[PDB]
Amino acid sequence: LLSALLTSVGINLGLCFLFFTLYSIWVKRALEPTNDEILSNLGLDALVFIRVFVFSIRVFSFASVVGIFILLPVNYKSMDNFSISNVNDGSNKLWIHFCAIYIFTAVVCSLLYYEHKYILTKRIAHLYSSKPQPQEFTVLVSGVPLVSGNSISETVENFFREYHSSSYLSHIVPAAFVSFRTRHGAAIATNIQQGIDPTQWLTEAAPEPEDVHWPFFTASFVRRWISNVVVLVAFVALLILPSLIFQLFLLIVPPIMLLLSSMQGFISHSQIEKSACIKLLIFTVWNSFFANVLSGSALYRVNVFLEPKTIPRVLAAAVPAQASFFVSYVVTSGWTGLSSEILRLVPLVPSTPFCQEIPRILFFGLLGITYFFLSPLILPFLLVYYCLGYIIYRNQLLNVYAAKYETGGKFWPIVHSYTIFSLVLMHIIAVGLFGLKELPVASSLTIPLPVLTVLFSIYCQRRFLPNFKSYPTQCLVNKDKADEREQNMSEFYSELVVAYRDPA
Amino acid sequence: LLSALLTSVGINLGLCFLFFTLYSIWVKRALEPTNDEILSNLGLDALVFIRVFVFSIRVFSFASVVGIFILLPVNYKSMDNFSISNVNDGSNKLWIHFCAIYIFTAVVCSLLYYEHKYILTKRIAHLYSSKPQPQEFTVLVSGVPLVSGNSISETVENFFREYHSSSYLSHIVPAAFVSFRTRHGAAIATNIQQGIDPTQWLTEAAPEPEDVHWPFFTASFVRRWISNVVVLVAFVALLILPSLIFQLFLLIVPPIMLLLSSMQGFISHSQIEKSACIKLLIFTVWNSFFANVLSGSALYRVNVFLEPKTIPRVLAAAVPAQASFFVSYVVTSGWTGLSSEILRLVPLVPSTPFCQEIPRILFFGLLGITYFFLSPLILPFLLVYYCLGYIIYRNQLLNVYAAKYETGGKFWPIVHSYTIFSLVLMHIIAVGLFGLKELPVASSLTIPLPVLTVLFSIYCQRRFLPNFKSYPTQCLVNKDKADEREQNMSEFYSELVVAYRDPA
Ligand SMILES: CC(C)CCC[C@@H](C)[C@H]1CC[C@H]2[C@@H]3CC=C4C[C@@H](O)CC[C@]4(C)[C@H]3CC[C@]12C
Ligand SMILES: CC(C)CCC[C@@H](C)[C@H]1CC[C@H]2[C@@H]3CC=C4C[C@@H](O)CC[C@]4(C)[C@H]3CC[C@]12C
Ligand SMILES: CC(C)CCC[C@@H](C)[C@H]1CC[C@H]2[C@@H]3CC=C4C[C@@H](O)CC[C@]4(C)[C@H]3CC[C@]12C
Ligand SMILES: CC(C)CCC[C@@H](C)[C@H]1CC[C@H]2[C@@H]3CC=C4C[C@@H](O)CC[C@]4(C)[C@H]3CC[C@]12C
Ligand SMILES: CCCCCCCCCCCCCCCC(=O)O
Ligand SMILES: CCCCCCCCCCCCCCCC(=O)O
Ligand SMILES: CCCCCCCCCCCCCCCC(=O)O
Ligand SMILES: CCCCCCCCCCCCCCCC(=O)O
Ligand SMILES: CCCCCCCCCCCCCCCC(=O)O
Ligand SMILES: CCCCCCCCCCCCCCCC(=O)O
Ligand SMILES: CCCCCCCCCCCCCCCC(=O)O
Ligand SMILES: CCCCCCCCCCCCCCCC(=O)O
Ligand SMILES: CCCCCCCCCCCCCCCC(=O)O
Ligand SMILES: CCCCCCCCCCCCCCCC(=O)O
Ligand SMILES: CCCCCCCCCCCCCCCC(=O)O
Ligand SMILES: CCCCCCCCCCCCCCCC(=O)O
Ligand SMILES: CCCCCCCCCCCCCCCC(=O)O
Ligand SMILES: CCCCCCCCCCCCCCCC(=O)O
Ligand SMILES: CCCCCCCCCCCCCCCC(=O)O
Ligand SMILES: CCCCCCCCCCCCCCCC(=O)O
């Protein structure tokens, strides 16, 4: 089998060039800038995207070295002879895999810990050095009460003038954009329930003026609730070398998810794309990983996940068999993805690659973590993909893309949570596998690993993640005070008050 | 069997009097006061307690009438001949039970809707008419940073003076009680993350000065985290007519749960008792309902709940058989509970009956809802219990109890959530039972009932429940402004600043 896999790779390389030819009928410039240049020139989303690649390179450089030089010779010309499945049942060499599963997990968790601190330092620093933006001082208020004898405008200003008299500026219009004097003031309007009735006078931080999903305002509350039901139904209906054809059809799914999320009741394109990103993560895990591992009907797969006590064995006995599939998958989707982006085949639309690429990076990471333990020969393919991606994307972000919004580093929590999922899924597989390999002690001793990993995640959920949703009082106050001395707020406020005028 | 059940009731009545005799070796006065007198004289917790009884009386007066005059004759001298189990398999009379399950559920949900509105009206009104209390303006800050060259006191005042300069008053002491000028000010300190690091400068509204669990402050953060692990372990270890003996041992469980919760890291006796209340709800559901229904070992019961697709049949086939058990249980625990309280056998300690009685009321409600559908003859026993309870407790709250704290109506969310659980469990049983009774159409059509019930619950979770955790800006501001005209805040503040002095 190894020579067939190498042949497949050669075929895919040949296809790459044939497609470039049909279409027609940089490294130093990408790598030299440092991360501080990325934060100043592109911003936090670009920086997180790059750090996701760095994280993956570190995770898999480690995994590749251990996988290839320590575990691979234990496991060991078919691909299978290099997998854990070639280890004798009951073997004490499985304790090497056991140590590796805790060390690898500890390393991944350590790397996540590091990235959380790194990214937050950059995020707090970004706030302190940046200029004030209209979206930082503006709240979108919705569910404005219908008051006889009064317009929506009158209802909104009376509410905010009465309850936020020290911070209210002005507003524009059953919803309105309300401006505040300070970031802290806006935080209060969005963090503390406003009216007696919590389902009205709803507050959310405003998106950028240029990122407002203006069609949002067309629908009434009932009308948009009806549409979000339709979106969910359509999403589920969507969920429920010829492999190239498969990949080519996957290339149109992101557009589907975006148009689908656009009618779900979001107020911004950032939310629509983030929502589509999440739908793609769900979609890819279901339609690529579980669909190929748990081969069968959609009903069969659903029934598998209704019986938790058997999941470890269903996956431990199903996943290893797909290692050769996934090498092909990664190579095909790898070059399809990278060539598609270089040649701009998608618009031939999101202003950034995040919606479509974060799910590719993360899906590959799922396979990397899962197969480090089970079949290490996948790891060098993933490592090459990530290294090429890193070079290519540093160039594409600097010279090709033109983001129409900034979301701080709000994609980072996706990466964290998805990574914990990848580790936990792998741990579940390992528990099941040590069971199948007749090493029940390891199977039992590995139960605490998912638990500690989840507790680690919870620690991070309480310790780091809240700062990606909002900034704390200490931070916002220090900046509001700095702005009072450093920024010309008397002009900022004149822009702020008309920033959200509907440009029509 | 019916004559044996009547004999058992007669025996229990005889035992009641024998026990009163050994111990020794009002209705108009309880019922005449209205709910406004309860709110003014006893407060919101007493009012909620009474409304829980009113809710149960209305739920079971309805259920008793339908159960006894509509379903009972359909079902129909053993007790079993009056149960749903006596209905022919495949019978169209099961559509009566089917209609009754939706009507009953709609009625219970309607009654919950009503109570949520009623209770909140009383809660908002209570806030507007009451005098300011020290606990409304005080925040307990914990996780105060260790700063070289500075005391904890210095660290706390510098943080609040710098970030809450418009509202800070004073504080007393790795934790401190910090006072604010307004309720809104305190709300900001407790609702918005304070420091950069969310695990430090933690803020929580202070409990009453007389309700502070002072031992809390003895432990360091690590030391109390160690203890809460011990509490969980001890709790689980506790979880894992001779029926009187059983009930008598259950009477010591509340003391165990209270001492157990006292070392878990709570800051007040209100939290300890509420925590114990929750542990008792968990304990009773596990050790009384599931232990008797799912007869077997603890491991067996745990395994039952690891297979969701079979739960409906395991319970549908197990619960109906216990109807005679539960009639005896309700009668025995009913008189044991009421006589124990009248004679003060528990102190021969909580200042109120809430910790111990809310779980009795709610457990009985679980049985009422479950057996309305399956065996209606239980319902009159529950109805008598609730009616006697209502009379007895109105008297005990007015003349016997002396609460050492006020928690608003914070027990109400327990009642809501527990009630939704009771309805959902009953719906699960009904789905399983219509399956067992060969009426698969009803089994299928009942699936939406748990779903709508849960969506109703979610609606209430967003619509009503947040107001039981805190008051909204509109409410707090209207009151802070009223206090500026109506209350002598210049004296309140002098009491506020020393209110939490450790009385030692
Ligand atoms: C059998 C298949 C369908 C299982 C997949 C479901 C679970 C295990 C995975 C798939 C993708 C994941 C999500 C991706 C993005 C986000 C946004 C963040 O703000 C909170 C967590 C959250 C919401 C993740 C939690 C867990 C998740 C929902
Ligand atoms: C077998 C398949 C379906 C995987 C197992 C699913 C369960 C047991 C595990 C795997 C990883 C876990 C998640 C890891 C990260 C986060 C982010 C936070 O915002 C909420 C909790 C949340 C979302 C966890 C919930 C439970 C979780 C989804
Ligand atoms: C098989 C047995 C162990 C099942 C029992 C577990 C579930 C179904 C029940 C038992 C008691 C219930 C709880 C009682 C009190 C409260 C406090 C409130 O602020 C939020 C909900 C919450 C936390 C309830 C949610 C559901 C609950 C946890
Ligand atoms: C068979 C036994 C174990 C019962 C079934 C358990 C599940 C499916 C259901 C029954 C009732 C439900 C609960 C009803 C009320 C609340 C209060 C809110 O604060 C959080 C959600 C929460 C806590 C729900 C979560 C899920 C729930 C616990
Ligand atoms: C198993 C032990 C060996 C471990 C070897 C680890 C090597 C890691 C190399 C990571 C290089 C990442 C460079 C990122 C540069 C950047 O910050 O953009
Ligand atoms: C197990 C065999 C492989 C050994 C490990 C090889 C590590 C290769 C990755 C080095 C970091 C490259 C970072 C990307 C930018 C670049 O190409 O310079
Ligand atoms: C293998 C299961 C456990 C997973 C969790 C491992 C987490 C390890 C990282 C946390 C310790 C970080 C210590 C940093 C100290 C410093 O600041 O120098
Ligand atoms: C028996 C089948 C098991 C699989 C069930 C999968 C359920 C996943 C539901 C989506 C959870 C993520 C919610 C996203 C919230 C958001 O938009 O930020
Ligand atoms: C065997 C199947 C089990 C499936 C378990 C699915 C668990 C879904 C968890 C949803 C998490 C949603 C978190 C949102 C947090 C946020 O709002 O930021
Ligand atoms: C307080 C936080 C607790 C977190 C617990 C997270 C548990 C996630 C599931 C991982 C363990 C699954 C093990 C199944 C073993 C089996 O039953 O065969
Ligand atoms: C039952 C034990 C669960 C432990 C799971 C790991 C949770 C993370 C522990 C903290 C790691 C960071 C240590 C440095 C703390 C500091 O100096 O701030
Ligand atoms: C088969 C899996 C079903 C899902 C149940 C297991 C997941 C339990 C939830 C764990 C995440 C808890 C997130 C809140 C953390 C916190 O307390 O701050
Ligand atoms: C099945 C249809 C018949 C329904 C009959 C319902 C009778 C309900 C009686 C409830 C009385 C509750 C009195 C409570 C007094 C109070 O507010 O304290
Ligand atoms: C199905 C047969 C029973 C018929 C319904 C009987 C209703 C009895 C409850 C009436 C409300 C009593 C309220 C408690 C205070 C009191 O006793 O006056
Ligand atoms: C049987 C499943 C559905 C359960 C949910 C039923 C909820 C019914 C109560 C909501 C409607 C209340 C209308 C009140 C109108 C008014 O204010 O007069
Ligand atoms: C397989 C066994 C199924 C039973 C699992 C029961 C888990 C119940 C855990 C307690 C949930 C309630 C949390 C209370 C939070 C609070 O203190 O307010
Ligand atoms: C078949 C077994 C299923 C068991 C499912 C248990 C679900 C537990 C839900 C816990 C709810 C905790 C809500 C706390 C809300 C709050 O903090 O106020
Ligand atoms: C958006 C909120 C969704 C709420 C969904 C709540 C579902 C709770 C479980 C009740 C239905 C259980 C039916 C099991 C039927 C079976 O599989 O045999
Ligand atoms: C898929 C449909 C789910 C419906 C579940 C019931 C949720 C409650 C609906 C609102 C009931 C109250 C109606 C009165 C509204 C008002 O006038 O304020
Ligand atoms: C076998 C049961 C396992 C538990 C999974 C079913 C319960 C799903 C959670 C439903 C409650 C959601 C509470 C949040 C409501 C909201 O969005 O505001």
Side-chain angles (χ1 to χ4, degrees):
Chain A
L1 180 60
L2 290 175
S3 67
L5 291 170
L6 292 171
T7 298
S8 180
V9 172
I11 293 167
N12 284 285
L13 292 171
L15 291 171
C16 297
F17 290 106
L18 292 170
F19 177 80
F20 280 110
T21 298
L22 292 171
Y23 179 85
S24 75
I25 298 169
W26 285 109
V27 174
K28 290 180 180 179
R29 289 176 285 173
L31 297 177
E32 288 175 355
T34 188
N35 284 340
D36 291 342
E37 293 179 79
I38 297 300
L39 182 58
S40 293
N41 294 335
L42 300 177
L44 289 170
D45 290 302
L47 181 60
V48 171
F49 190 84
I50 292 167
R51 295 305 300 180
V52 174
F53 276 106
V54 172
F55 174 80
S56 292
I57 292 167
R58 289 177 178 183
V59 171
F60 297 114
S61 292
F62 178 86
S64 182
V65 172
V66 173
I68 299 302
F69 298 112
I70 297 170
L71 298 173
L72 181 67
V74 174
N75 292 347
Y76 183 81
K77 294 180 180 179
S78 65
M79 189 180 180
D80 291 342
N81 291 340
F82 295 94
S83 75
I84 197 166
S85 295
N86 199 51
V87 177
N88 287 331
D89 294 345
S91 175
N92 62 315
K93 293 180 180 179
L94 290 169
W95 288 109
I96 296 167
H97 292 81
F98 182 83
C99 291
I101 199 169
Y102 289 82
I103 293 166
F104 178 63
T105 298
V107 171
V108 173
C109 291
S110 180
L111 290 169
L112 288 170
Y113 184 84
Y114 178 89
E115 291 301 314
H116 282 290
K117 287 173 67 175
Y118 184 87
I119 293 168
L120 288 171
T121 298
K122 293 290 188 183
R123 179 162 163 76
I124 298 299
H126 179 67
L127 179 147
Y128 287 131
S129 69
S130 70
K131 292 183 179 180
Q133 305 294 310
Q135 69 269 22
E136 294 183 283
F137 294 78
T138 303
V139 177
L140 173 62
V141 181
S142 65
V144 176
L146 305 178
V147 179
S148 297
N150 288 264
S151 68
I152 294 300
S153 177
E154 289 172 309
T155 299
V156 172
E157 67 189 48
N158 287 341
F159 184 84
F160 285 91
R161 289 175 66 84
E162 184 65 21
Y163 299 112
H164 298 275
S165 67
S166 69
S167 62
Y168 174 82
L169 291 169
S170 71
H171 74 96
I172 62 171
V173 178
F177 290 94
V178 178
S179 299
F180 294 95
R181 291 179 189 280
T182 64
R183 293 177 184 81
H184 188 64
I188 293 166
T190 59
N191 293 324
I192 298 173
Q193 181 183 318
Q194 294 292 300
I196 299 302
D197 180 347
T199 64
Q200 58 182 304
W201 294 113
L202 300 171
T203 55
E204 185 176 2
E208 291 91 329
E210 66 272 21
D211 198 44
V212 176
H213 186 65
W214 286 112
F216 171 79
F217 291 92
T218 298
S220 69
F221 177 80
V222 172
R223 180 69 184 86
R224 69 175 63 91
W225 178 255
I226 292 167
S227 295
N228 72 25
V229 172
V230 172
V231 171
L232 178 60
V233 172
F235 172 67
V236 172
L238 181 60
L239 289 169
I240 299 171
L241 299 179
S243 67
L244 182 58
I245 294 166
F246 174 74
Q247 182 61 53
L248 292 171
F249 280 108
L250 291 175
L251 292 173
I252 65 168
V253 173
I256 293 168
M257 294 299 190
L258 289 164
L259 292 171
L260 176 59
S261 293
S262 292
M263 68 185 182
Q264 195 172 352
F266 292 111
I267 65 170
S268 70
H269 297 287
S270 291
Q271 290 177 341
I272 292 166
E273 291 181 20
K274 185 179 180 186
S275 179
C277 183
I278 293 169
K279 287 182 178 65
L280 289 169
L281 290 170
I282 293 167
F283 183 89
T284 301
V285 171
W286 182 255
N287 291 95
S288 180
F289 183 77
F290 287 116
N292 291 307
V293 172
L294 302 177
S295 176
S297 68
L299 180 59
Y300 171 78
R301 287 191 289 277
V302 171
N303 287 341
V304 170
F305 294 106
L306 297 176
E307 298 182 53
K309 71 182 184 181
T310 64
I311 291 170
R313 296 292 185 88
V314 172
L315 296 175
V319 173
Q322 296 298 311
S324 64
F325 172 79
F326 285 111
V327 170
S328 180
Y329 180 86
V330 172
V331 172
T332 299
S333 69
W335 71 265
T336 298
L338 293 171
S339 293
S340 179
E341 185 170 359
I342 291 167
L343 299 176
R344 313 301 299 152
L345 299 181
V346 171
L348 295 171
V349 176
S351 65
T352 68
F354 285 66
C355 185
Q356 295 181 10
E357 185 63 17
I358 291 293
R360 183 175 289 107
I361 293 167
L362 291 174
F363 184 72
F364 285 172
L366 184 64
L367 297 175
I369 291 168
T370 298
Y371 289 104
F372 163 74
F373 177 73
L374 301 174
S375 184
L377 293 175
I378 197 168
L379 293 169
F381 288 96
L382 291 169
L383 184 58
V384 170
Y385 178 82
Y386 291 124
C387 292
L388 291 172
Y390 175 82
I391 293 167
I392 291 167
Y393 286 107
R394 286 168 62 93
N395 183 50
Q396 293 289 306
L397 292 170
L398 291 168
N399 295 309
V400 176
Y401 287 107
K404 300 295 184 182
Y405 63 83
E406 179 176 308
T407 51
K410 289 179 180 179
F411 281 87
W412 175 251
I414 292 170
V415 173
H416 172 81
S417 295
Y418 194 91
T419 298
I420 295 296
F421 162 67
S422 296
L423 289 170
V424 172
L425 182 63
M426 179 274 288
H427 296 153
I428 290 167
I429 292 167
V431 170
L433 186 61
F434 284 121
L436 291 171
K437 299 300 285 168
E438 304 292 346
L439 191 67
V441 175
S443 181
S444 180
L445 293 172
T446 300
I447 294 294
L449 179 60
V451 174
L452 291 171
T453 300
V454 172
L455 291 171
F456 172 76
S457 182
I458 292 168
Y459 174 80
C460 291
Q461 290 169 34
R462 293 179 181 179
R463 177 65 182 81
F464 301 117
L465 291 176
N467 287 342
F468 288 98
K469 296 180 187 291
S470 67
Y471 290 93
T473 297
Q474 180 174 32
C475 183
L476 292 173
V477 172
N478 287 340
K479 179 63 167 178
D480 284 339
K481 288 180 175 179
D483 284 348
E484 290 178 355
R485 295 189 300 275
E486 298 177 354
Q487 303 294 322
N488 188 359
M489 292 304 294
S490 73
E491 293 179 358
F492 175 76
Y493 289 146
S494 294
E495 292 181 351
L496 177 62
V497 298
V498 295
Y500 291 89
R501 180 177 176 180
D502 187 345
Chain B
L1 180 60
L2 290 175
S3 67
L5 291 170
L6 292 171
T7 298
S8 180
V9 172
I11 293 167
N12 284 285
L13 292 171
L15 291 171
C16 297
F17 290 106
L18 292 170
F19 177 80
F20 280 110
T21 298
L22 292 171
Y23 179 85
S24 75
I25 298 169
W26 285 109
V27 174
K28 290 180 180 179
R29 289 176 285 173
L31 297 177
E32 288 175 355
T34 188
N35 284 340
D36 291 342
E37 293 179 79
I38 297 300
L39 181 58
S40 293
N41 294 335
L42 300 177
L44 289 170
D45 291 301
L47 181 60
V48 171
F49 190 84
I50 292 167
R51 295 305 300 180
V52 174
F53 276 106
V54 172
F55 174 80
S56 292
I57 292 167
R58 289 177 178 183
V59 171
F60 297 114
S61 292
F62 178 86
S64 182
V65 172
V66 173
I68 299 302
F69 298 112
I70 297 170
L71 298 173
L72 181 67
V74 174
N75 292 347
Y76 183 81
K77 294 180 180 179
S78 66
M79 189 180 180
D80 291 342
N81 291 340
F82 295 94
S83 75
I84 197 166
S85 295
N86 199 51
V87 177
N88 287 331
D89 294 345
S91 175
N92 63 315
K93 293 180 180 179
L94 290 169
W95 288 109
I96 296 167
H97 292 81
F98 182 83
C99 291
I101 199 169
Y102 289 82
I103 293 166
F104 178 63
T105 298
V107 171
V108 173
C109 291
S110 180
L111 290 169
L112 288 170
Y113 184 84
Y114 178 89
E115 291 301 314
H116 282 290
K117 287 173 67 175
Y118 184 87
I119 293 168
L120 288 171
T121 298
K122 293 290 188 183
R123 179 162 163 76
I124 298 299
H126 179 67
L127 179 147
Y128 287 131
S129 69
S130 70
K131 292 183 179 180
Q133 305 294 310
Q135 69 269 22
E136 294 183 283
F137 294 78
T138 303
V139 177
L140 173 62
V141 181
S142 65
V144 176
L146 305 178
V147 179
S148 297
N150 288 264
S151 68
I152 294 300
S153 177
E154 289 172 309
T155 299
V156 172
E157 67 189 48
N158 287 341
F159 184 84
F160 285 91
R161 289 175 66 84
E162 184 65 21
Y163 299 112
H164 298 275
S165 67
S166 69
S167 62
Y168 174 82
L169 291 169
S170 71
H171 74 96
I172 62 171
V173 178
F177 291 94
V178 178
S179 299
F180 294 95
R181 291 179 189 279
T182 65
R183 293 177 184 81
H184 188 64
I188 293 166
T190 59
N191 293 324
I192 298 173
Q193 182 183 318
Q194 294 292 300
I196 299 302
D197 180 347
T199 64
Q200 58 182 304
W201 294 113
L202 300 171
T203 55
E204 185 176 2
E208 291 91 329
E210 66 272 21
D211 198 44
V212 176
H213 186 65
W214 286 112
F216 171 78
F217 291 92
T218 298
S220 69
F221 177 80
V222 172
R223 180 69 184 86
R224 69 175 63 91
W225 178 255
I226 292 167
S227 295
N228 72 25
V229 172
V230 172
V231 171
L232 178 60
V233 172
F235 172 67
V236 172
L238 181 60
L239 289 169
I240 299 171
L241 299 179
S243 67
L244 182 58
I245 294 166
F246 174 74
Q247 182 61 53
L248 292 171
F249 280 108
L250 291 175
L251 292 173
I252 65 168
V253 173
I256 293 168
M257 294 299 190
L258 289 164
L259 292 171
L260 176 59
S261 293
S262 292
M263 68 185 182
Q264 195 172 352
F266 292 111
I267 65 170
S268 70
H269 297 287
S270 291
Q271 290 177 341
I272 292 166
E273 291 181 20
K274 185 179 180 186
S275 179
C277 183
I278 293 169
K279 287 182 178 65
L280 289 169
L281 290 170
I282 293 167
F283 183 89
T284 301
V285 171
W286 182 255
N287 291 95
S288 180
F289 183 77
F290 287 116
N292 291 307
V293 172
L294 302 177
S295 176
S297 68
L299 180 59
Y300 171 78
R301 287 191 289 277
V302 171
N303 287 341
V304 170
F305 294 106
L306 297 176
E307 298 182 53
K309 71 182 184 181
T310 64
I311 291 170
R313 296 292 185 88
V314 172
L315 296 175
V319 173
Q322 296 298 311
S324 64
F325 172 79
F326 285 111
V327 170
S328 180
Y329 180 86
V330 172
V331 172
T332 299
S333 69
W335 71 264
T336 298
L338 293 171
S339 293
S340 179
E341 185 170 359
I342 291 167
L343 299 176
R344 313 301 299 152
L345 299 181
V346 171
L348 295 170
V349 176
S351 65
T352 68
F354 285 66
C355 185
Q356 295 181 10
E357 185 63 17
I358 291 293
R360 183 175 289 107
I361 293 167
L362 291 174
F363 184 72
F364 285 172
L366 184 64
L367 297 175
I369 291 168
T370 298
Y371 289 104
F372 164 74
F373 177 73
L374 301 174
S375 184
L377 293 175
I378 197 168
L379 293 169
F381 288 96
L382 291 169
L383 184 58
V384 170
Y385 178 82
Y386 290 124
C387 292
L388 291 172
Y390 175 82
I391 293 167
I392 292 167
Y393 286 107
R394 286 168 62 93
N395 183 50
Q396 293 289 306
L397 292 170
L398 291 168
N399 295 309
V400 176
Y401 287 107
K404 300 295 184 182
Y405 63 83
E406 179 176 308
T407 51
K410 289 179 180 179
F411 281 87
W412 175 251
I414 292 170
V415 173
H416 172 81
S417 295
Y418 194 91
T419 298
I420 295 296
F421 162 67
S422 296
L423 289 170
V424 172
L425 182 63
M426 179 274 288
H427 296 153
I428 290 167
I429 292 167
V431 170
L433 186 61
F434 284 121
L436 291 171
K437 299 300 285 168
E438 304 292 346
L439 191 67
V441 175
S443 181
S444 180
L445 293 172
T446 300
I447 294 294
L449 179 60
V451 174
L452 291 171
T453 300
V454 172
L455 291 171
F456 172 76
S457 182
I458 292 168
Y459 174 81
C460 291
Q461 290 169 34
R462 293 179 181 179
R463 177 65 182 81
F464 301 117
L465 291 176
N467 287 342
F468 288 98
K469 296 180 187 291
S470 67
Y471 290 93
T473 297
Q474 180 174 32
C475 183
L476 292 173
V477 172
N478 287 340
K479 179 63 167 178
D480 284 339
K481 288 180 175 179
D483 284 348
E484 290 178 355
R485 295 189 300 275
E486 298 177 354
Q487 303 294 322
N488 188 359
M489 292 304 294
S490 73
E491 293 179 358
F492 175 76
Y493 289 146
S494 294
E495 292 181 351
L496 177 62
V497 298
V498 295
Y500 291 89
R501 180 177 176 180
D502 187 344

